[PDB]
Symmetry: D2
Subunit: 380 residues, 4 copies
């Protein structure tokens, strides 16, 4: 029924055999056959399929309202598997501020295999229409993006991809299936870095992919079985377990996000704030029309590098570390940590200023997170 119930009872996460109310961990590579080719429960070799991995795959398929799920050893392994649907000579359109790892994979790995990449400002979907070439075969969008939280119209992108014969892909990491369901809006494939919110506890690196398309699912299963970037059973189990509390965690994060943004907008040491909940944010209405909540990632400007470092040192409850979607709130400075290879003039032009801070809001007490960040900003 409602989302919080679906999180507990959706998918197959119990043991039909013993009745165990949690998915058994099949730390196993192979399976007895009673006769040659007769598999007791459909399993024959864990790379091809493993029951614990099948459990988490059923969960992500259910949560995204798809038919088929796939679990990979990381988010970028899921992305690479999806890109491998294409052939040399094919063209893929991506949002222009796509995740750094995605941009690296496409421009430094897959370009050597003849895949051509164009980065497009998809906040206006007619940019996609202009960028389509005869060889374009895939449209890949994140929304909202990192670290400036740009929003792209999912439904319109799905329609464009249908009309032009493209495979449409949404990286739904920042929103999670709790708030945004791209397959319901016509997208062919949805994927996640489960390393972030889905696992939720900073203790699994994993990717998840869901689709309703039987033929794309067959192709993805073949790619998974042949290139072998599969998630192991212990990590699959920890994913199932972490997803149980996804709804509670996201709701707490959202309460804190709302109060923190109020504080940041009022504070004199903060300039611009980036988050899709802000009414003046580009495509705010598009976001509200395709999602019923918010990501916990916020970016905001302080004056300079020194202020950013001082802010980090002055907080008690914000942890300096890579990644996002933890139960701990995390803080980072993109210009120094993720975007430092880009020359400073280009960073400035793109809005990645020296004082741009990114926080990933965790599940600490809302008042504590607001007060801590405020007093730290007061030290500037």
């Amino acid at each position: 029924s409602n989302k919080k119930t679906k999180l507990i009872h959706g998918g197959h996460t119990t043991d039909d055999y013993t009745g165990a109310v949690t998915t058994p961990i099949y730390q196993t590579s192979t399976y007895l056959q009673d006769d040659i080719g007769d598999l007791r429960q459909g399993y024959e070799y864990s790379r091809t399929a493993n029951p614990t991995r099948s459990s988490v795959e059923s969960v992500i398929a259910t949560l995204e309202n798809g038919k088929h799920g796939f679990a990979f050893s990381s988010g970028v392994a899921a992305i690479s598997a999806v890109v491998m649907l294409l052939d040399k000579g094919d063209h893929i359109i991506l949002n222009s501020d796509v995740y750094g790892g995605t941009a690296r994979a496409l421009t430094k790995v897959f370009t050597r295999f003849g895949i051509e990449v164009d980065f497009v400002d998809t906040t206006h979907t007619d940019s996609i229409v202009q960028a389509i070439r005869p060889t374009t075969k895939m449209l890949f969008i994140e929304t909202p993006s990192n670290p400036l939280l740009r929003v792209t119209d999912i439904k319109k992108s799905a329609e464009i991809a249908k009309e032009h014969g493209l495979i449409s892909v949404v990286d739904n990491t920042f929103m999670t299936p709790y708030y945004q369901n791209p397959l319901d809006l016509g997208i062919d494939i949805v994927l996640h870095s489960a390393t972030k919110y889905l696992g939720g506890h900073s203790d699994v690196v994993a990717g998840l992919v869901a689709t309703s398309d039987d033929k794309l699912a067959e192709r993805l299963a073949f790619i998974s079985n042949s290139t072998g970037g599969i998630l192991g059973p212990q990590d699959s189990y920890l994913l199932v377990r972490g997803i149980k509390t996804l709804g509670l965690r996201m709701e707490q994060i959202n309460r804190s996000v709302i109060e923190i943004i109020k504080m940041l907008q009022a504070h004199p040491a903060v300039q611009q704030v980036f988050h899709p909940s802000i009414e003046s944010h580009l495509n705010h209405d598009v976001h509200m029309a395709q999602a019923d909540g918010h990501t916990g990632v916020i970016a905001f400007e302080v004056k300079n590098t020194e202020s950013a470092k001082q802010l980090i040192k002055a907080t008690s409850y914000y942890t300096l570390a890579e990644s996002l979607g933890a139960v701990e709130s995390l803080i980072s400075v993109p210009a120094l940590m993720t975007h430092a290879s880009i020359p400073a003039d280009i960073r400035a032009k793109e809005g990645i200023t020296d004082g741009l801070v990114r926080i990933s809001v965790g599940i600490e007490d809302t008042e504590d997170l607001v007060d801590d960040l405020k007093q730290a900003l007061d030290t500037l």
Copy 2:
């Protein structure tokens, strides 16, 4: 010093911090930074590096006398990472009877990216010399191969690859680092399905890669970090643990292999036997010159499909299942299980007859394994 000591004390598999005599399992995705960019022990994000994965990587680098190790989510993920060293238009030479998963990856995935594949009978290394094109960039060999255990001269292949500017790769799964060390013979990259002997307990799917080449190691690390087929920490731990007993397991397996082959050669219901220890086997002397023991995989012919099925049903201690390198002995029929897509006339021509049985010798009592297989053959 000696191999069995190196297996226990080689690599870094203790905790410098607490002194724990086993590698801690770092079920974690990210790491506190004390200042922006200052990593306490070199860790910042588990996809890039994880201490438990670094432990197993140090083990495989030590065991293969290399400098750099890499742990992947499966053997075929390690193979795919190594193939991704190449660009569209490049050509790779493989032994003609390479592992089915390798052939599938190259001919159904990487060929779509412009990688060209030629299958060559490398049991005569001058076949490699003939097959080299101007665009050839990699030579990839298994020895001994599956399921007919063909042997390829590693040292000569390394010399050919050096002379012609090729990256040389040996899939050393069947022999393990306990018996065969391709990097010592001049090969650039050695890799393993750790799913088999290294893990040894049929409970991990994993790949391992080792090299002494700093530049190839940098390229492999970039590919791993960008396409993300990494081994998780629990599986890395179980690998380290299983490798501890590699020497004992391989030695027991070898004692049983010798006695089983004597029995098979004497038995009237068995025709041809395939194993590199047999003096009339092609390149037996090459094998003995590049290895100081034997794989536990043996293939032998009984009369037909019905005899093969009857043999399997009549054994007590041979388990019908996919994979090899378990503590249990495993039995299979390639024509029905791994090679069934090849038309029967082609199978027959290649020696994959309907009665070809493959066994992977485990660590059961030698007398029991000999007697069990013999009495089962007596029922034919």
Copy 3:
């Protein structure tokens, strides 16, 4: 600061060595000593102490505002360790409806060792005063109790125990440290079946004990080290992980508890409802004075056994299984499942009627849980 922040940042649950933001899993039994008796970080043998177990022990000590924590292989192992503080000839007072496993341990095991047990209705603390003998050395109370949720005044029991030289113990399982902190009210020892709410995911069996008393802590450490009922490192890790979401889970459970009780009180097929939040419940004011929330366990009467079974069959979201404190709501019938050895006339006299149903409210959507239980009751 506030409880939800303390749950994330309280205790020591990161790695000082690598900075890993989660507690490493020390799957290890022993530790290198650099010189005889010089321990690198205080560890020498995992039965005595293990770093992952020390992490969860620090968490429970912090959450209960104690100084010392202890992790056991189950709730009843924690209880047995605490009972072993006593000697033959000593007397222990327990609430008269104590948990079945506790009653079994004391009356069928520890009584054979000369420990004498008296069951007392502690809802009136003067019953404790009457029951005190010269040999009484321990007062052990649960509040609220199972399955009728009787409430005992913790502060008054602590004062009585101080005055008469008794060790006071509270089994705080049903309330958790999120809502009730017995050590703050003067109790010597607090303990939990961490199998329930603390782990929270029905995937760990564990006990936890906390105290502020240095001498009792030394005695408990000696008992743990000598009788060895220690929690293992994987289970310790899963406990730390599950406790992260304790606050969110308990708050969702409490919202659902309030709405479900409204529904049950209004429903014509339900007679008596047992829960400390009900204003006419005995010692409701005592509960509100010593706790700032509620347990998720509720008991209520339907007409008879047949109605109870029908109710269970008619629900969609209530799972028939033993235990409580899961993310799934659980349903049971004490007269058939936990109390069936008591003769029916005694059960009836005690209020354990054939139609008494117990539910443990999970974290499903509140509206779904209310509507599901209501429609199922409507089928009666």
Copy 4:
């Protein structure tokens, strides 16, 4: 059939449901019931029974030729459960040099519950006959003992216990079921610290108990369920896995033991050597009659404390740490590490001299272990 086969195929260590060739890890606390009291596969609550724990219990029952197995959270938890078969006023006879943890549990814990303990030199079984009181109910022996490896006649002790109505218990840790099977010699209960050889990899703390007596098994199951010192599922799995290689490990250890003892007996810096394989060792013939191999624990005298410390520092392959039965060889000095609370004059009288060194032989290369210990002794 033969022991090495039984180690692989004995007990139930596969999944009947999927065919997985390894025991699934049931990280779970409770189990769905299809109707009240109808358990799908006999499971209802993991403290009472867990399928992974049942797997390791079946293994130890099979390996010891018993009917019932029990897995505890440590060796001393298994011992405490067995002692709890007794009542206040009962008397237990133990060998006089029993393991320190056992002596501590009995003389500092169970004596407070009215259990009376007598330490007896059981190397002459008539000492047992003299020590029997009207209240004696249990005879508990280790053989060989620590650290002087005293041997006790198991068959004669079993006969004495039968004749006088005692429960007989053998702590079979040092010999393992691979070499010594006390239940076959008439003993009622056999137990192990599985922390040592059975797990074999220094990564599990665990106890195991086996019996053929249905009534004692029922009593032990009740004690386990009521006091809750159960082994968790991950540790149970690692035990099953480690036991697979028990035979190979013990055989390698025995080859090394034989060569090391030759070296120690010849070396001028070594005085007395303690090991049951030495022909002049007390009850050498008794040991050879009740076992068909040897423990890997050896003790030997060097001159003094300074020589012992120097020896430890001079070795390359002997690791200074507590415990025994690892894949690494371990070295210790009992007078400083396990027996330091005993006054020095008593230690000297008992043979625990300042220069007594204990080694636990691991599975390193035999020549390496001999040569390393010899060169280190040469530095004296």
